[PDB]
Subunit: 137 residues, 3 copies
Amino acid sequence: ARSAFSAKRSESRVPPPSDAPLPFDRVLVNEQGHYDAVTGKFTCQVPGVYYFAVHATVYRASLQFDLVKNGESIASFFQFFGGWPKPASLSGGAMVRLEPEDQVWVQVGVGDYIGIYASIKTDSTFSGFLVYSDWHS
Amino acid sequence: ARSAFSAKRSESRVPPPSDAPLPFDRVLVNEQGHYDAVTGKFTCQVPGVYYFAVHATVYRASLQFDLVKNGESIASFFQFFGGWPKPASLSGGAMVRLEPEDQVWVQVGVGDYIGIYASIKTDSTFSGFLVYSDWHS
Amino acid sequence: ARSAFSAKRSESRVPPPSDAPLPFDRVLVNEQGHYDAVTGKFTCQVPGVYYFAVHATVYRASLQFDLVKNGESIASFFQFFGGWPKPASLSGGAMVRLEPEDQVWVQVGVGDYIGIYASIKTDSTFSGFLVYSDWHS
């Protein structure tokens, strides 16, 4: 079985909202269409164990994000932004078992820690892939 | 073949010891039981090449950790903690060939750089998985 | 199919050049020889989708790097180095589809942000692996 995606954040002057999934609308690879660039969500179609990774640029505010499965935090990450003139960075990752229709996305969990960023020479990426399948009848 | 795990650090007021593996006792996924949440060690049962990743929160002290194979550093990582009021972050990762009974874990390598952290909205994760097997007779 | 590698940066007093790939000449694993420790480049021999990750130590200058495919930026990353006495850190990663003869490497994209580092207890690693193949006739 196969399932993989990777996408990047678009540049924006709008402070990132913290009441919806973080958007990663510039798709690098999504051959199964399991990631939805409009909603920011990965939707599982193959039961199995997956790795997810976020590699974010942090600027103008601290960044707190949760990797979530159906709304539940799998793992939470944070980077302090101490009033610096240029960006910092924050990565997070974890593995999880998924079943078909389960969804995974990234979301700010503490609503003012919204400092995810992209610019001409900086990106924030969200990637995930099936490591092994585990189908059952 | 299949082998994968991911686990997170528990919250604790105890400064992390630097004379034993770092603990990640909150298991996200460990379907083969190849990771041991009591010892903090992954023990290989399938020869092959693996990826390991640590995504850590850093607070109250700088953090230095080694990804180790049987006690030997595969790769070492560090993040300065400059007297900030909230956490920083540190990720590390590498690939390695393992044979059955080989063990991989995370450990502080410089014994005062013990700033690995977890809290209600921050985590430190340790994950690893088989990318391909290479059995021989 | 199989393809994987991981390598680390050597210690050096020379400020890193920004007109060539960043070198990672200490090989951890490269069983197919798809990575070239002399050039710093991975060259694809199996069509498919790959994950790449860089886990860098940052010291003496800020670090900006691009993960590149044939010279084109897949994704760009940055970490501010604010005049601190010890290193910071920066990770980046993404997935990409490759075909045979495509090359992937890491390079400084803004030519003074050259702060990638290694020392006795710090490393910078570059890793990548095939997640699934997609051969065609």
